[PDB]
Amino acid sequence: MRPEPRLITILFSDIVGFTRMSNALQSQGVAELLNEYLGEMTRAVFENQGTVDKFVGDAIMALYGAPEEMSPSEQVRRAIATARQMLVALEKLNQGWQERGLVGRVPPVRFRCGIHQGMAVVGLFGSQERSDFTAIGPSVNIAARLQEATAPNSIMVSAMVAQYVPDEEIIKREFLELKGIDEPVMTCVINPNM
Amino acid sequence: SHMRPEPRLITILFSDIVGFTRMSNALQSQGVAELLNEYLGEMTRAVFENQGTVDKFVGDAIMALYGAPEEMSPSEQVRRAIATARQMLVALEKLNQGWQERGLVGRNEVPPVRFRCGIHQGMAVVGLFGSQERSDFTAIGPSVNIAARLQEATAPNSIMVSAMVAQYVPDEEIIKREFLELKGIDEPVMTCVINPNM
Ligand SMILES: Nc1ncnc2c1ncn2[C@@H]1O[C@H](COP(=O)(O)CP(=O)(O)OP(=O)(O)O)[C@@H](O)[C@H]1O
Ligand SMILES: Nc1ncnc2c1ncn2[C@@H]1O[C@H](COP(=O)(O)CP(=O)(O)OP(=O)(O)O)[C@@H](O)[C@H]1O
Ligand SMILES: [Sr+2]
Ligand SMILES: [Sr+2]
């Protein structure tokens, strides 16, 4: 648990359109919708041996390579599989929400995911009032920035991650100017299928 | 830790600093953790001392709740939230002074750390969210979104609250009043910058 430097893969995912959709239901319905979604995301992370760092509203943060050790290649394979499984889950959820009148009659929820691999100080951070296991550093900052920079319903990863992805699966490449980073970052949108 | 999601009038506080990453690039692993913990310690102590609830940390950002899980009058929620925000800002200045003396800031031109805080009071669904596999206690809804947006809209080293919060603050303690259009918000919001001092 004690914080230490380690090569890990960070995954950030978020949905946009949840608030708008929930705007019609009462508290109970809002909670049911969100729990439905968070449960699916958690399942996608656990099934691929990932660590659920935390939820941030309707955003999710997962780690691969901590606390349990994991090779860099397996971290990426698992992180990618999680992102693709999350998209499938959202496709299922959206189908249910549309047949429910929550979407279509309010557009379908959209998904964005960013994945980066790099060094990060990982372990328990906080105080006596509150301590949580997480990852800190530019690598984490970058993964979050990728998630916010990618287009609707897509997965964006860094070059460090893409090097383990079959070439034919990289749909689009583009250098992006990310906040706090001087050197433009080569990003790769990967095929959400396989 | 057992609370099922329920609607409730609460006060949400979001605070965040800028300059940690920059300041920490000039240090090493163990130093990062100790530096982050030093700051987080000051922040949580400010929340705890004011009987607030620390919801979570989001990197170096802090989220605190007043009125949940334990009940709290709407006026006490604001008093404690306001006192919390002010104490955090004072602690940050104390921290910057120490970091300055240690050469962590004001050297290799790493500006001193900047603090921002947003506070809003309104209805929110509070309780455990997630699934049997993983769930955490937090607050959800437009009211929470607004508090987050107020913190990101206010200027460096300042505290910004909504009209719902201001109504409990002595008028002379309100530095500035202005309408700002927050994201996803149809009706512009009345923002009030509070004096960092009582
Ligand atoms: N429970 C929670 N804990 C921490 N932050 C929360 C939160 N609920 C909401 N927020 C914060 O409130 C802000 C919401 O603004 P946005 O991210 O722009 C909403 P959106 O992604 O555009 O659509 P959405 O509301 O359907 O998800 C974010 O900064 C988010 O992290
Ligand atoms: N441990 C963590 N958990 C969740 N999100 C994290 C995180 N560490 C970093 N992030 C995310 O990474 C992004 C960092 O970008 P910014 O918020 O713009 C940093 P900043 O506030 O400008 O300066 P700073 O790095 O000194 O804090 C945010 O979206 C933040 O929420
Ligand atoms: Sr979102
Ligand atoms: Sr910050």
Side-chain angles (χ1 to χ4, degrees):
Chain A
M1 288 181 268
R2 219 295 170 296
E4 56 175 60
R6 177 180 306 192
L7 176 56
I8 62 170
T9 303
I10 304 96
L11 180 157
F12 278 106
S13 66
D14 182 47
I15 47 173
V16 174
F18 169 73
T19 296
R20 171 167 292 298
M21 182 183 310
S22 56
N23 282 320
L25 314 179
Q26 282 296 81
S27 74
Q28 193 71 308
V30 173
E32 291 193 302
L33 289 183
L34 186 61
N35 288 327
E36 191 177 9
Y37 160 67
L38 296 170
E40 285 297 330
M41 296 302 94
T42 295
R43 191 176 182 177
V45 175
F46 287 178
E47 272 179 24
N48 295 283
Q49 298 78 59
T51 292
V52 169
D53 183 307
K54 60 171 73 64
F55 297 147
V56 179
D58 54 26
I60 297 75
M61 180 184 176
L63 303 175
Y64 301 76
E68 307 187 78
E69 215 65 6
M70 196 180 277
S71 66
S73 65
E74 276 296 284
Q75 286 177 20
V76 168
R77 186 184 70 70
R78 287 177 171 164
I80 294 299
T82 297
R84 290 176 170 156
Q85 195 177 311
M86 293 180 152
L87 266 175
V88 169
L90 264 293
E91 289 274 44
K92 181 181 66 176
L93 296 178
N94 269 317
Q95 175 63 198
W97 296 331
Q98 176 181 300
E99 311 178 329
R100 184 162 158 182
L102 301 175
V103 165
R105 169 175 287 295
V106 179
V109 173
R110 295 188 144 52
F111 172 87
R112 287 182 168 76
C113 174
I115 305 173
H116 179 54
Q117 174 179 277
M119 296 305 294
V121 182
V122 189
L124 285 176
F125 291 87
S127 58
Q128 176 171 49
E129 291 70 56
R130 181 64 173 296
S131 62
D132 277 305
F133 178 79
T134 191
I136 294 293
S139 297
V140 183
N141 298 164
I142 287 167
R145 283 155 195 165
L146 291 184
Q147 179 265 291
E148 308 181 314
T150 203
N153 302 321
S154 66
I155 302 167
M156 184 178 280
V157 312
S158 63
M160 197 68 63
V161 172
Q163 70 187 318
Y164 298 97
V165 184
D167 309 316
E168 58 281 8
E169 278 170 40
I170 301 179
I171 309 304
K172 176 175 181 173
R173 288 171 169 287
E174 160 168 37
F175 278 97
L176 293 185
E177 284 290 2
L178 301 186
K179 169 184 182 177
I181 308 298
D182 301 296
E183 294 299 308
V185 185
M186 166 56 73
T187 65
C188 307
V189 178
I190 70 166
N191 175 39
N193 304 310
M194 191 175 91
Chain B
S1 58
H2 297 294
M3 194 190 300
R4 291 180 283 84
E6 62 167 55
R8 199 138 116 186
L9 180 61
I10 58 169
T11 304
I12 308 97
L13 182 163
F14 277 103
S15 67
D16 179 46
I17 58 170
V18 178
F20 173 69
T21 296
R22 190 72 225 303
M23 174 176 68
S24 58
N25 97 292
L27 55 58
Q28 44 296 306
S29 180
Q30 208 63 65
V32 182
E34 301 194 68
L35 184 48
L36 217 198
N37 293 325
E38 170 175 26
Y39 157 73
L40 293 175
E42 281 297 325
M43 297 301 105
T44 57
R45 280 197 291 291
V47 172
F48 174 78
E49 282 180 39
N50 289 288
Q51 297 187 54
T53 294
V54 177
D55 180 305
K56 65 171 70 68
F57 302 134
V58 180
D60 48 35
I62 317 288
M63 179 180 174
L65 304 179
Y66 300 74
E70 185 183 302
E71 197 82 313
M72 187 181 286
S73 72
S75 66
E76 278 292 289
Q77 281 177 26
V78 170
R79 185 181 72 59
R80 286 164 174 172
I82 294 291
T84 295
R86 284 177 171 150
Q87 192 178 317
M88 293 175 151
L89 198 164
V90 166
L92 184 69
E93 295 175 305
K94 179 184 69 174
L95 284 170
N96 270 317
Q97 188 56 44
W99 295 328
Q100 153 59 51
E101 286 165 27
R102 296 168 59 183
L104 283 178
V105 297
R107 189 174 74 91
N108 216 289
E109 273 35 76
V110 180
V113 177
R114 302 185 184 183
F115 177 84
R116 286 180 179 66
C117 180
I119 311 179
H120 177 50
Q121 174 179 279
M123 296 302 300
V125 189
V126 185
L128 297 173
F129 288 93
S131 70
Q132 288 179 279
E133 300 192 273
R134 177 55 175 290
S135 67
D136 280 298
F137 179 86
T138 192
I140 293 292
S143 289
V144 181
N145 303 327
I146 292 171
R149 299 191 171 91
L150 291 174
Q151 180 266 293
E152 305 187 319
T154 200
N157 295 162
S158 72
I159 309 170
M160 178 177 285
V161 308
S162 66
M164 190 68 54
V165 177
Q167 71 184 309
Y168 289 96
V169 180
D171 316 329
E172 30 281 296
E173 280 174 36
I174 303 297
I175 299 176
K176 176 182 64 180
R177 308 197 67 188
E178 183 183 62
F179 284 75
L180 298 174
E181 179 173 60
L182 308 183
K183 177 184 175 182
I185 309 303
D186 296 298
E187 308 294 2
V189 182
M190 164 57 97
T191 64
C192 310
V193 175
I194 63 175
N195 193 300
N197 278 272
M198 189 177 105

